């Protein structure tokens, strides 16, 4: 009987391809296959995901070229990834992470082929500039439900699964399909790579910002500072006096003096200080 602690370690490559494909495919419930591997009874390793040329209808999608897929499989065996199918994924742009009826049927087929297949869902609409809305799934056996058996033995505390979503519950979560825990593992190369991605070049690292633009920038910032000081003086002219405590934040829903003052003073700190430092450092380092 399957275990609760089952994990799916998805390669960063796989995640990026999934998300890019789905974001391209919005709103179409675009679909793709992935090659991974079943290392053991507690883990599934997902390596790569490649899409499907099919472009069906604005409510549904369909497999077009089994020949396409078989050829991709053979060739990737030749070079690329000698993995072989472990599941499939499709975007649900703005629905959560639940499986429609057709989704469940496709799965049923996948499991019939390989009892431990996996389905995957991604929400490029919802996946934020930060956390990413994704999940994995495997069906629930109606035979087990009728017999009273249970999906997985939870020989762990890895069954919290971060508060299964109400939407997934509604659409059928844990009554026909159950979530699984995703993870990201890096063999240090992609890891330090990821680190490199944002890192910028010493070109700029030493490139002092032009100084005429900087002088004008300071001029503008000091002007807006003067005005913010005026309105701040007016605001403090009463502040607690005349007791806006009941007014609280609702004293005015606009134009807080202090917050703007601190924001702009901080930014002009940054600008002026670092530019002066770069000036000093260059003057002295190029000799």
């Amino acid at each position: 009987a399957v275990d609760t602690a089952e994990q799916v370690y998805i390669s960063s490559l796989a995640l990026l391809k999934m998300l890019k494909h789905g974001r391209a495919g919005v709103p179409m419930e675009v679909m793709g296959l992935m090659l991974g591997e079943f290392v053991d009874d507690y883990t599934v390793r997902v390596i790569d995901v490649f899409a499907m040329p099919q472009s069906g209808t604005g409510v549904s999608v369909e497999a077009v070229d089994p020949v396409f897929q078989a050829k991709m499989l053979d060739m990737l065996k030749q070079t690329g990834r000698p993995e072989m199918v472990v599941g499939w994924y499709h975007s649900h742009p703005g629905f959560g992470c639940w499986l429609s009826g057709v989704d469940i049927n496709t799965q049923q087929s996948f499991e019939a082929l390989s009892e431990r297949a996996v389905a995957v869902v991604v929400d490029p609409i919802q996946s934020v500039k930060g956390k990413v809305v994704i999940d994995a799934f495997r069906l629930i056996n109606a035979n087990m439900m009728v017999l009273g058996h249970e999906p997985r033995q939870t020989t762990s505390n890895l069954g919290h699964l971060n508060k299964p979503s109400i939407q997934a519950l509604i659409h059928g979560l844990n009554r026909h399909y159950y979530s699984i825990t995703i993870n990201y593992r890096k063999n240090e190369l992609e890891q330090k790579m990821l680190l490199n991605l944002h890192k910028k070049s010493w070109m700029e690292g030493l490139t002092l910002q032009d100084y005429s633009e900087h002088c004008k920038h300071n001029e503008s910032v000091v002007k807006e500072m003067l005005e913010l000081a005026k309105n701040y003086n007016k605001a403090v002219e009463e502040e607690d006096k005349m007791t806006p405590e009941q007014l609280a934040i609702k004293n005015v829903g606009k134009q807080d003096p202090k917050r703007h003052l601190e924001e702009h003073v901080d930014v002009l700190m940054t600008s002026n200080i670092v530019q002066c430092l770069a000036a000093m450092l260059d003057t002295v380092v190029f000799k």
Partner: peptide, 29 residues
Amino acid sequence: ELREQLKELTKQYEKSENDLKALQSVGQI
């Protein structure tokens, strides 16, 4: 009448399949 019956059946198949495909395309707003 083999060829004629086959042709008529094929025409029916074509129209029926096209109608089913047509039935599966919701509208927009």
